[PDB]
Amino acid sequence: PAWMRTLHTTASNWLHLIPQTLSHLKRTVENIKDPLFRFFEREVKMGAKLLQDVRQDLADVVQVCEGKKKQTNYLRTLINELVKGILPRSWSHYTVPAGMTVIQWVSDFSERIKQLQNISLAAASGGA
Amino acid sequence: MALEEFLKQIREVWNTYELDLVNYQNKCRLIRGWDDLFNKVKEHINSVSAMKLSPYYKVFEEDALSWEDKLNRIMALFDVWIDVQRRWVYLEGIFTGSADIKHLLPVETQRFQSISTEFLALMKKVSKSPLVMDVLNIQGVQRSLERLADLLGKIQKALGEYLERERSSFPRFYFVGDEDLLEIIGNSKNVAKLQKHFKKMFAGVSSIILNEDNSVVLGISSREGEEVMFKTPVSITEHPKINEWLTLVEKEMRVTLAKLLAESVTEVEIFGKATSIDPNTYITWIDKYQAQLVVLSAQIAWSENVETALSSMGGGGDAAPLHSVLSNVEVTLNVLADSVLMEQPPLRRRKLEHLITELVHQRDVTRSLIKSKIDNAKSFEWLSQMRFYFDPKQTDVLQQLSIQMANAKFNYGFEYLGVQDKLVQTPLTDRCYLTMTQALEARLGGSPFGPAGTGKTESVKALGHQLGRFVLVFNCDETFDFQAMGRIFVGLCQVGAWGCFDEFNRLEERMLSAVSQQVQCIQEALREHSNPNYDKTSAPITCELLNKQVKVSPDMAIFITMNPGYAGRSNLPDNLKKLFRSLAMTKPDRQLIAQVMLYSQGFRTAEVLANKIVPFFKLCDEQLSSQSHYDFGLRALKSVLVSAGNVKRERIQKIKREKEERGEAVDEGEIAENLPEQEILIQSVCETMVPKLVAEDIPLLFSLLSDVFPGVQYHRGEMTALREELKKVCQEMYLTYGDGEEVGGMWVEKVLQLYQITQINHGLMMVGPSGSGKSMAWRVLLKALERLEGVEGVAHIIDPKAISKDHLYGTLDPNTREWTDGLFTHVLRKIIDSVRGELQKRQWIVFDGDVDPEWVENLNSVLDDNKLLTLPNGERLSLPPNVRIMFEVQDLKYATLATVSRCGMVWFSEDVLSTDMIFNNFLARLRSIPLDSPMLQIQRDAATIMQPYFTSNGLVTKALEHAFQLEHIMDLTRLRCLGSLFSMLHQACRNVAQYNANHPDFPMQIEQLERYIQRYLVYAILWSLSGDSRLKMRAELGEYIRRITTVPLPTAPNIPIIDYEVSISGEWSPWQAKVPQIEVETHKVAAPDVVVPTLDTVRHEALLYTWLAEHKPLVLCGPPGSGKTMTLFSALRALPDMEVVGLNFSSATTPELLLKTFDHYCEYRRTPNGVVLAPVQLGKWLVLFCDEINLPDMDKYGTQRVISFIRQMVEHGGFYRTSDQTWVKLERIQFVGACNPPTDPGRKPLSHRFLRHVPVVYVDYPGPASLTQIYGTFNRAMLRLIPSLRTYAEPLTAAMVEFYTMSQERFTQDTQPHYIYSPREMTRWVRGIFEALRPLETLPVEGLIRIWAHEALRLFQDRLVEDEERRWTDENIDTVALKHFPNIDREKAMSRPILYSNWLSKDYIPVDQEELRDYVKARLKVFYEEELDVPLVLFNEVLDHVLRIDRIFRQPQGHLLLIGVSGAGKTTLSRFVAWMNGLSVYQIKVHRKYTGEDFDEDLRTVLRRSGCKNEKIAFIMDESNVLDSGFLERMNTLLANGEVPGLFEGDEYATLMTQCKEGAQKEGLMLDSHEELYKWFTSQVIRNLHVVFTMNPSSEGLKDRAATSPALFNRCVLNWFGDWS
Amino acid sequence: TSIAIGSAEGFNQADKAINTAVKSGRWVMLKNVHLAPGWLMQLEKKLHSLQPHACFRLFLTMEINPKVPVNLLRAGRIFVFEPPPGVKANMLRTFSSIPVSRICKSPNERARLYFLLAWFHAIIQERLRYAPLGWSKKYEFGESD
C-alpha cells in the first residue's frame, strides 16, 4: 500500500536522527551525596528507558513495512497513530505542550537525548 | 485416657448448662450470655477437632463425631436465635408503643401478631426447659427459627414508609439507616441500646449520661470522655416518646453550652488584658470547661481586647494599646507552651494544643494590625478578620455570641462538637474563611476547588466547627441522583446542618443539572430568613423538596469540594455554578502548618524542625525516582507531624521508665531539655516514608536525610517479641524466615514495616509485582499478632473488580427507594453492629485486586480522617478503631493522587521474595504434606533427590534465567513456571506410588527412584519454561540445559530433548514410540472424536494429563483450529471421573455466565464451615472449559471482570454470592482455558496475577509433515470405499496439503477478518469428499478430482470478498490438481461450473447447470403457492447459492453466516432452501418495544420445538434483529454448545423437563434423570436447530462482529454473497 | 416555569408544564436540554403538532453541543450567547443588565463605582481573548462575578 511505503521511509529516517546510546550514571558512595548527581541520574534513567522503547518500536514498524514480522495489536495501534501523525501515547513520557504532533516530538526528543548523552559523558569522563 | 476425659468434660458441661433467662417487660424470658454460649461451643468444637489429630482418636471416634454433630447443631440454632430475638425486641416495641401503626399498616400489624405468637410460644417452652440440650431437641426448632428469621425480615422491610414518617418528627433520624432507626424506635425503653446510635445523629455526642433509673438524661458525653452536664435535666418519664425527649436533649445541649459559655467568658476576661497569668488558675479554667468553649472563650476575649484598643486609638496619634493585646497573647502563649513541655492528661493536652493553635493566629493577626498602623475599629484589615462579640445582656442565651467576618454575621449553633482536631489557621485558610462566609451571607454555597490534599474538606468543616454547626461530609459518586440528593437536603434543611459534598463532580452531568433546582429553591428560602420584614413569630420558612413542603433552618449550608483537574469528571452546568462561590485552594502553607503543629506538641526547636521537614518533603518529590505509589503532599507531611508527637510522648514515657529503675530523679523540665527532637522527627519520617521506597531510592533518602539533618541516625527497634512469633508462624506455614541479610530477611523486614503502617494508618496499600510475597506478609502478620497480643485476627478478602460496583457498595432502589447493602458495606456494617463480638477482634478488609478511581474513590471519606463510609441513602458508617482497610495490588497505574495520598504504602519488589525462598517452600511442603506414610516416604526421598538442583545458582535457577530471554506466546512470570514445575514434580511422585501399586512385590528402589527423578525434573523444566513457546524456542532451551546440566540426557545427534519422555524405569524413551501409524475405521474418517497420533498430540496430551490430574488450572494457547479443544478432550478421555462443561467467552462475557453454569451443574449446600459449591454428580470433578478466555472486554483501567473472578476462584478457592454477601467455597471444580495469542485482534493479554496460577501450553498448527500424517491416514481410510482409487491416496493428500498451505499464506487476517484457514478446513475437506463417496459403488479418478475440486471451492472460495481472490482460488485449484494428478482428462474433472446436488437423484452426485435450473424453477413454482408468493428471477449465482445453503442444512449444527447487501435474496433463498429440506422457518418478530426477555422467550420457543418435538428449524435472524448486545451473547453460546445455561430457569426448566421426558419417550430412550434429559435435549438442538445469520458487508462491523460473537466465525459457515455482480 | 432536564421527574414535569402553558399563555423554560438529546427529538415532534396560546413561549437552554438534534435546531430560532465582542460591547451589556434604579440610589458616587466595575469587568473578560498573555489560564469570569 501507499501508506506502507511512506511510513517505512519516515521510520527509517527517524532512526537516523534519534541517537542510539545512553549510558547510565555510575552510582558511587560520594556521588549519592551530590544533589546534582541525584537529579541528573533520574534524567538518564528515565531517558534511557524512553530511548530504547522508541527505537525498538520504530525498528518493528520498519520490519513490519518490509513484510518481515506480523502486525500485532500494539503495532496496529502504533502504526495507526503514525499514519495519522498523532504522537503515540506510549512515547509520551515527559510533559509537552498540548497539540504537539509526532514530527515535532521526534526532533524534540532527539535534541533531549543529545544533551543527556553529554551529561553522562561528563560524569563518565571527569566525574560528577 | 486423656481423650476420654475430654469427652467426659464435654458431656458434663452440656448436661447442666442452661440458657440464662431474663424477664423482658413481664412478657417472656429472653436469653443473655451469647458470648458465653458461643465461646463455649467454639471451645469444644476446636477440642473435638484437635483431638482427631491424636493417634488415640480411633477408639473414641464415634462418640467424638456424635459431639461434633451436636455442637454444630447448637451453633446453627443459636446463631439464628440471637438474630430472631434481637429483631423481635425492637419490632415488638414498635408494634406495641405506637397504636397509629396498626391503622397505617394493618396487614403488617396482623402478620407481626401471628409471628409474635409463635415466638412467645417457643419462649415459654424454653422457660420450662432452659437446658440447652432440651432446647436443641425441640421438634423442628431449627426450621422454626429459620422461618421466624425470614418472616421477621419481611416485616422489617415493610416498615419503610412508617420510618419515613418518623424521620420528620426528629429530623436527625434522616441520617440513620432503616434498621438502626427501628432499633432506636423499638428500644425506646431500653435506653442502653440507644448509645451506639448517637454518633450518627450528632456531631460530637457519642453517649448520654443517665441516672441510676435511666429515666432522666443528665447530660451528654463525647467519644473521648468529655462530659457536658445539663443545667436542666431532661426527664424521659414525663416525655416518654422517643422523638420528644430526643428533641429536648438537643435543645438542652444548645442551652447548656450557651450558659456554660457565658460563665467561661466571665472567667477568661480576667486572663485577658492581664500582665501575669498564674498557670494553676489558667489550667484550672481549661479543665473546668469544654474544649470547644475554651477556644471560643479565648477568641471572644481577644476580639473584645482588640475592639477596646482600636476604640482608644480613634485620634490616630494616640498611643497604641494594641501592644498590650499582643503582650497578653505573648504571656498566655508562653504559659500554654510551658504546659505542653511536660506531661499532661490526654484531654487537657489536646485542649492546650487547641489553645496554642488559636493564639498563634491571634498573635499573627495582632502583629499584622500593629505593623499596618491600624487605629480604627472600622478599618477593613480588622473587619476582614473573624471577630467574636459577646453580649451578656442579651435575653436569649442562644444569641449572646455573634461571629462576624467582613459584613457576614453568624450566630453560634451551639452544637456539641466534642474534641475535634483543629486546623492551623493559615493565610489560605483565612482566605477560605473570608470567601465562604461571603457566600453564606449572600445565601450561596461554597465551592472550594483544587488538587487533592490541599485542605478543601477540612477547611469547610473547620469553618463549620468555628460557627458551632453540625457539618456532614458526603463522599459523592454517580449513585447520588436527584432523589438521593433531595432527601439528604431534606434532612440538612430541617436539622440546620451543613452539607459538605466532596467529589461533587463525580455525579452525572444530568444529575448535576437536576440538583441545581433543589439547591436554588433552598437558597431562596434561606433569603426569606434574612428579610428584616419577616418576623420569627410567623409561618416558618419552607421550600419545596421532592414535591413536599420542607421547613428550612437558617443555620443550614451547602458546600461542594471538587478537583476540576481530574479528567473524566462531570462538568457542572453554569446554572448550578452560579449558585456557588468558588475559591482556589492549590498551595497549602506547609511550613506554617508544620511550625504550629510541632510548637503545639511541645517541640522546643519547632521553628528549626519546620524549616527542615517541609523542604525535605519537597526534595523527596524531586530527588527520588518517580513512582505511582509515591506521595509527599500535605497528608504525608501531616502523618509525619502527628507521628512525631506520638514518638515524642513514648520516648518521654520511656526515659522516665528507665528513671524509675535508676534512681528517683524525675525532672520533667530537664527531661525535655535533653531530648533528641531531630531524631524523633527522623524516626517518624522513616517509619512512614521508607516502606514505600523502591530499593534504589532507599540510599537516596538517607543521603537526603543526612543533608538536612546532619549527624542524626535512624535505628529501628529490634522487635524481638514480634519476630519470635513471626518465626514460629513461618515454620507452621512452610515459609522461610530470615534476619537481616539471610534468606528471607528482606521479606521479614517488609512484614515488620507493614506492622508499623498498621499502627499509624487505618488504610494502607501493599504494592508490588505478582509474586512478591505481599499476601503471605499480611497473612503471617495477622496470625503472629493473634499469638502475640491475644486478639483474634479476621481477614475479609474482597476482589473489588470481580463484581460490579453496585454489588460492592450497594444499590438504592429506583422506585421503592430501599437500600440493599453491597459486599463491602455488608462486611463493615456487620463489624459495627458487633452482634458476635466483631469489635473485640482485629478486622482486616483486604481489597485484593485492581485499583481504579471508579470504585476506590468511594472510600475517600473512609481512608481520610473522616473515617466514614457515606451512602447515597444518607447513611454514614463510622470505621471502628479495630478495622484496617488494606489494598493488595500489583500496580497503581490507574489510581489517582486522592487515593494514593490517603493510604500508607508498603512497596514489595520481586527481590523481596527470592527464588530460593520459593524453592524452600515447595520442598518443605513436599516433605510434610502428603499428596495422597508410604506416599510421604516417596515424596521425602524424592525431595532429597531434587534438593541439589533447587539450590541457588542450581539447574532450575539457571534454566529460569535463560527462559526469560526467550520468546513466549504469553508474558512470562517466575511463578507461572515454578507453579507448573511443582505441579509436574508432584505428579512424578504419584507416578512412583502408582508403580508401587503395580508392583506390590518390589517397590521402586532409591537407585531407580534417583534415576527417574533427575530425568523427570529435566523433562518438567522444559515443559514448564518453554511449553508456551514455539518449537524453535523449546529446542533452544534444550541445548542450554544440555550444556549446564549433569543429568544424563538422550545421546541422539539432532533430536531435541523435548522429543523424549521419561519412563518409570528412569530411562529416556523417545515420544515416537507412542506414535503408531494407525489405520482408521472407514466410518470414522475425520470424525470429531478421532485423533490421529502425532508427535505433538502425544506430548501435549501427557502434559495436559499431569496438570489436569492435579486439578491445576491451565490455558491452551494457539491459532484458531490448532487442536486445543481436540487435545484437551483427548486427554480428558484418559482421565475419568471428570466432566467437562464448555463455556464460550465473548467480548461481553461477565462472571454471570460462569454463575449460570454453576446453577445448572452444581449445588450450594450449607456446611458448618460455610457454603460449599460442588457438582451435582458425586465423585466427579467438574471442568469448566473456557474457549476464548482472553476475549472479554478490558475496561479503561486494564481489568477484565471475569478474569478477576476466575483468579479469585483459583487463588482463594471461591467467590462471594452477591445475593446474601456470603463466601462460597468451591469443591471438585477446576478450570481449563483456551485462547488465541494475545497479539491477535480482539485479544487482550491476561493479567499476570491470573497467569501465576495457570500454566500455559502453546499448541501450534501442525506442520506440513504432521498434516500429511494426519490426513494421509484419513484419506487411506476414506479411499477404501472405492478399491480402484486406493493408489491415489498419497497424491490426494499432497494436493490437499499444498492447496491448503497456499490458501493460508495467500489470504490472512490482514486482508479480511474472517480469512482464517486451519486444519478445520482440512477436516471438513476430507469429510466432504467422504460424504460424497459413501453411496458410490465405483468412481473414476477424474470423478475423485471433481469432488476434491468442488469441496475446495466450498471451503476456500465461498468466504472470499473480492473477485481477484476468487479468481486466484479458482485457478490454483486447477494448478494443484494437475501437479499431483497427471494423465487425467482435465475437462471432465475440472469443468468450471462444478455443481453437486442430491436433488435430481438419491445420491450427492454432480448436476448439470441447465438440469438444475429447470428443477429449481419447478420447485419455485410450488414454493410460491405454499410459502411465499414473491417471484424470483433465477440467475447463475442463485443456483450456486441455493446449493451452498442446502449443504449446510444437511449437516449437524449447520449454521450459516450469509453476508451481502440488503435485498439480494439472502433471507428468501434461505427460506426456499429450508422449505426444500423440510426445515421450519423461525424469525423473531421484532418491533420498537422488543426487548431482551422477549428474545429469551423467543429462544425458549425455538429450543422447545427443536429440542423436544424433534422439529428441524431454520432460525433465520438478521443483524437488524440484534437490538441489544445481549442478544448475541445468547446466540454465541447457542451456536457453539446447542444450549444456553441460564435460559430455562424456575418454572420454565420444570416445564422443559416434562417435555423432554415426553419427547425422549417418543424416541424409545429410557431417560428419567434431569441431567440425562438435558443432555438429550442439547443433542436434539444440535442436530435440529439451524441458525442463519444475515448481515451487510461492513469492514468495521465485520471485524467488530468477531469479538462479540466469535462463534459466528468458527461455528458458522460463511458465504460471501456480497452484491449482485 | 423553569425546569432542569436531567432528572426523570424533570421530564414528567416538563411535559405537564408545557401542556398547561400551551392552553394559558404561560412561559416554560427548560435548562440544559443538551443533556437529553434523545428526549429533545421527541419534544420537537410534540411541538410540531401543537397550536398553543398566542402568548405561550418555550425557552430551551443548552450549551453549544453537537449532540443537539438538527431537527430541533431547524424548528426553533437560535440565539448565541458568548463573550461580548469588545470592551464597548461588554460595558453596554453590563449597563443594560443592571436596573437604572440600582445605580441611581441616594449616594451620587454609586454611579462612578458601577462604571469602574463595568470597565474592570470588561477589561478582565476581554483579556481572556488573549488566551495566554491576558491570563495564564481561561478563567470563567462571568455574570456571577
Ligand SMILES: Nc1ncnc2c1ncn2[C@@H]1O[C@H](COP(=O)(O)OP(=O)(O)OP(=O)(O)O)[C@@H](O)[C@H]1O
Ligand atoms: N516468606 C516466604 N517464604 C517462602 N515462600 C514464600 C514466602 N512468601 C511467599 N512465598 C511463596 O511464594 C509465593 C508468593 O505468593 P504471595 O501470595 O505471597 O505473593 P503476592 O505478591 O501476594 O501475589 P499476587 O501478586 O499474586 O497477589 C507463593 O507460592 C508463596 O507460598
Ligand SMILES: Nc1ncnc2c1ncn2[C@@H]1O[C@H](COP(=O)(O)OP(=O)(O)O)[C@@H](O)[C@H]1O
Ligand atoms: N490548615 C491546616 N492545618 C492543619 N492540617 C491541615 C490544614 N489544611 C489541610 N490539612 C491537612 O491536610 C490533609 C488534607 O486535607 P483535606 O481537607 O482532606 O484536603 P482536600 O479536601 O483538599 O483533599 C489532612 O490531613 C488535613 O488535616
Ligand SMILES: Nc1ncnc2c1ncn2[C@@H]1O[C@H](COP(=O)(O)OP(=O)(O)O)[C@@H](O)[C@H]1O
Ligand atoms: N492429530 C490430529 N488428529 C485429528 N485431527 C486433527 C489432528 N490435528 C489437527 N486436527 C484437526 O484440527 C482441528 C482442530 O480443531 P479444534 O481442536 O477445535 O481446534 P482449536 O481448539 O485449536 O480451535 C480439527 O479439525 C481436527 O480434526
Ligand SMILES: Nc1ncnc2c1ncn2[C@@H]1O[C@H](COP(=O)(O)OP(=O)(O)O)[C@@H](O)[C@H]1O
Ligand atoms: N433473485 C431475485 N429475483 C427477484 N427478486 C428478488 C430476488 N432476490 C431478492 N429479490 C427481491 O428482494 C426482496 C428482499 O429479499 P430478501 O431475501 O429479504 O433479501 P436480503 O435477505 O438479501 O435482505 C424479495 O422480497 C424480492 O422482492
Ligand SMILES: [Mg+2]
Ligand atoms: Mg477533600
Ligand SMILES: [Mg+2]
Ligand atoms: Mg497476593
